[PDB]
UniProtKB/Swiss-Prot annotation:
Effect on the protein of changing residue 55 to A: Abolishes activity towards single-stranded DNA containing 1-methyladenine
Alphabetically ordered keywords of this record: Dioxygenase, DNA damage, DNA repair, Iron, Metal-binding, Oxidoreductase
Function per UniProt: Dioxygenase that repairs alkylated DNA and RNA containing 3-methylcytosine or 1-methyladenine by oxidative demethylation. Has highest activity towards 3-methylcytosine. Has lower activity towards alkylated DNA containing ethenoadenine, and no detectable activity towards 1-methylguanine or 3-methylthymine. Accepts double-stranded and single-stranded substrates. Requires molecular oxygen, alpha-ketoglutarate and iron. Provides extensive resistance to alkylating agents such as MMS and DMS (SN2 agents), but not to MMNG and MNU (SN1 agents).
Residues that bind Fe cation: 117, 119, 173
Record protein name field: Alpha-ketoglutarate-dependent dioxygenase AlkB
This protein's record includes keyword DNA damage: yes
Its EC number(s): 1.14.11.33
GO biological process: DNA alkylation repair; DNA repair; oxidative demethylation; oxidative RNA demethylation; response to methyl methanesulfonate; RNA repair
Named cofactor requirement(s): Fe(2+)
PROSITE patterns assigned: FE2OG_OXY
Native species: Escherichia coli (strain K12)
Amino acid sequence: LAAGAVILRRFAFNAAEQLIRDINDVASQSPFRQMVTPGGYTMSVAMTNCGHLGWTTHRQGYLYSPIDPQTNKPWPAMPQSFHNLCQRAATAAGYPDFQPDACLINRYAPGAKLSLHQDKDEPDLRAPIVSVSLGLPAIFQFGGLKRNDPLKRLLLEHGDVVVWGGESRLFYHGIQPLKAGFHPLTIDCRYNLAFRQAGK
Ligand SMILES: O=C(O)CCC(=O)C(=O)O
Ligand SMILES: [Co+2]
């Protein structure tokens, strides 16, 4: 895909049913919620987290916290299925030592989008992003280090895993408004699992 980045198409297909069961379990403790940006806007993507650290919005900016600010309880632990799939994908992608401490779970309803951004809240740039697609298909934009650097547009379908790191660790990326559709395992949405090393 780029220097240090790869798409492992359908890599998570066999694991997907189990991953979705575990999403449901995570969400039972820390429900999906549409977070409000530091600038005051409700995101169209609904999110939750598992693992030690959860990505959250705050008045002062984006940040990681071990506490879910909605439930005021810790985030649920990382499911075994998540851990195992992430490790295998990272290894296949050339990042054998990846040990995530954070998984952001994104839910896209039809029309939901995540505009171009960098994943720039993690101090240790040696660790890649491992990004798992489940359910409805989406167009993923993958750019460069500047907002106006040319974008690649890639369809991501159920089971696809994108990994970026090294040279491409800070590349701009996003998801275009989700097209309407049906998927037998997620019904009416796309999920994304975004694994990160957010701490030291
Ligand atoms: O849904 C995706 O594939 C991308 C999500 C994303 O970029 C993020 O969680 O920062
Ligand atoms: Co991102």
